[PDB]
Amino acid sequence: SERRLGVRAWVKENRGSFQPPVCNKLMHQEQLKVMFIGGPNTRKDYHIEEGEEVFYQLEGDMVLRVLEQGKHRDVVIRQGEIFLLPARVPHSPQRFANTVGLVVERRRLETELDGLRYYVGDTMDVLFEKWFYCKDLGTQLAPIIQEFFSSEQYRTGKPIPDQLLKEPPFPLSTRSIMEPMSLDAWLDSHHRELQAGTPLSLFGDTYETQVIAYGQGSSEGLRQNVDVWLWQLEGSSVVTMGGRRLSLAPDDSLLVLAGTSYAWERTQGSVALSVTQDPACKKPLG
Ligand code: NI
The CA distance from 174 to 269, in Å, is 40
Cα 48 to averaged position of ligand 1 atoms, centre (Å):
6
CB atoms closer than 10 angstroms to residue 129: 21
What class does CATH assign to 1-286?
Answer: mainly beta
* Residue 83 to residues 33, 47, 183, 267, Cα–Cα distance (Å): 16, 17, 9, 27
Cα 227 to averaged position of ligand 1 atoms, centre (Å):
19
Structure method: X-ray
Cα 83 to averaged position of ligand 1 atoms, centre (Å):
13
Cα 5 to averaged position of ligand 1 atoms, centre (Å):
24
Does the annotation list 91 as a binding residue?
Answer: yes
Does the annotation list 191 as a binding residue?
Answer: no
Residue 248 and residue 7 in contact, taking contact as beta carbons nearer than 8 Å: no
Cα 21 to averaged position of ligand 1 atoms, centre (Å):
18
* Residue 30 to residues 196, 225, 229, 249, Cα–Cα distance (Å): 33, 12, 11, 23
Does the annotation list 47 as a binding residue?
Answer: yes
DSSP tag of 149: H
Does the annotation list 245 as a binding residue?
Answer: no
* Residue 171 to residues 73, 87, 118, 137, 178, Cα–Cα distance (Å): 19, 10, 17, 21, 20
Grouping H, G, I as helix, E, B as strand and the rest as coil, residue 227 is coil
CA dihedral sign of residues 107, 186, 7, 14? positive
Burial 96-115 (b: 16+ CB within 10 A, else e): eeebbbbbbbbbbeeebbbb
Partner residues linked to 256 by β-bridges:
228
* Residue 95 to residues 39, 40, 58, 105, 184, Cα–Cα distance (Å): 5, 5, 12, 18, 22
Grouping H, G, I as helix, E, B as strand and the rest as coil, residue 204 is coil
Cα 49 to averaged position of ligand 1 atoms, centre (Å):
7
DSSP for 194-244 reads HHTT--EESS-TTSS-EEEEE-SEEEEE---SS-EEEEEEES-EEEEETTE
CA-angle at 143, arms to 110 and 120, nearest 5°? 95
* Residue 87 to residues 71, 270, 285, Cα–Cα distance (Å): 17, 32, 9
44, exposed or middle or buried, with CB in 10 Å at 0-12, 13-18, 19+?
Answer: middle
Cα 102 to averaged position of ligand 1 atoms, centre (Å):
12
Cα 140 to averaged position of ligand 1 atoms, centre (Å):
13
Cα 103 to averaged position of ligand 1 atoms, centre (Å):
9
Cα 237 to averaged position of ligand 1 atoms, centre (Å):
32
Cα 141 to averaged position of ligand 1 atoms, centre (Å):
11
**Distance between alpha carbon 192 and the CA centroid of its chain, in Å?**
28
Does the annotation list 190 as a binding residue?
Answer: no
One-letter amino acid identity for 118?
Y
The pairing of beta strand 46-48 with beta strand 4-6:
unpaired
Instruction: Kindly provide the resolution of this structure in angstroms, with one decimal.
Output: 1.6
The CA distance from 80 to 69, in Å, is 27
Residue 91 and residue 43 in contact, taking contact as beta carbons nearer than 8 Å: no
* Number of residues that make up the chain: 286
One-letter amino acid identity for 57?
Q
DSSP tag of 17: G
